[PDB]
Amino acid sequence: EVEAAISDVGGQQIFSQALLNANRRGEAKTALAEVQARHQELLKLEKSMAELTQ
Amino acid sequence: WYAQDQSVALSNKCFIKCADLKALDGQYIEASDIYSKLIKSSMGNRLSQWSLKDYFLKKGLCQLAATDAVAAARTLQEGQSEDPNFADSRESNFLKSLIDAVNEGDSEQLSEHCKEFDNFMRLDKWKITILNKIKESIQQQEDDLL
Numbered sequence: 001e002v003e004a005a006i007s008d009v010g011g012q013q014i015f016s017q018a019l020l021n022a023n024r025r026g027e028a029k030t031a032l033a034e035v036q037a038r039h040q041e042l043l044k045l046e047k048s049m050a051e052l053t054q
Numbered sequence: 055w056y057a058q059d060q061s062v063a064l065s066n067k068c069f070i071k072c073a074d075l076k077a078l079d080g081q082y083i084e085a086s087d088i089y090s091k092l093i094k095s096s097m098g099n100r101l102s103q104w105s106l107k108d109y110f111l112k113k114g115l116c117q118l119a120a121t122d123a124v125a126a127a128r129t130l131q132e133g134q135s136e137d138p139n140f141a142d143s144r145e146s147n148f149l150k151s152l153i154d155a156v157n158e159g160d161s162e163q164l165s166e167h168c169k170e171f172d173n174f175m176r177l178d179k180w181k182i183t184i185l186n187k188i189k190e191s192i193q194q195q196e197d198d199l200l
Contacts, residue, residue, distance in 0.1 A: 047174075
């Protein structure tokens, strides 16, 4: 007559992935992309003070 | 005459001018020797160290105009050891770089180094003349090697 055939229900697991804040944007965001123009200024101090020391 | 009077300073002013004119006249070895004397007189004097860096550079430049790159190398090593201010200076690095260019036979690399040094420290007329001579000696050596 009868027996077993399909059984369980209460039993499962799940992993979990993750995205990230957008503002993050490219690494260049404050104190990163400005270092290009901040360097020309610093080269200006170096120079103007080279005039100073000479 | 100033050196006999213990006028180190006026002596040095005269010997700067003598060495510069000698180097411009093709007398590179004697100019280097006068620069050696001037260096020896300016060691240990807190007041003159700025000239001292300049001094080392000029000596090497004459030694590069005489095609004696070994002399430039020993001058640069000497200055690096006896004057810490020269060791870390732009002049020492520039003279290392010129010696490296001369030993390689790469005149373009020398001109690049001259431009780089110019951007940070204006090459006066004298340095331009001696550096042009050094470049010409390099180019002449390739022209013979070709």
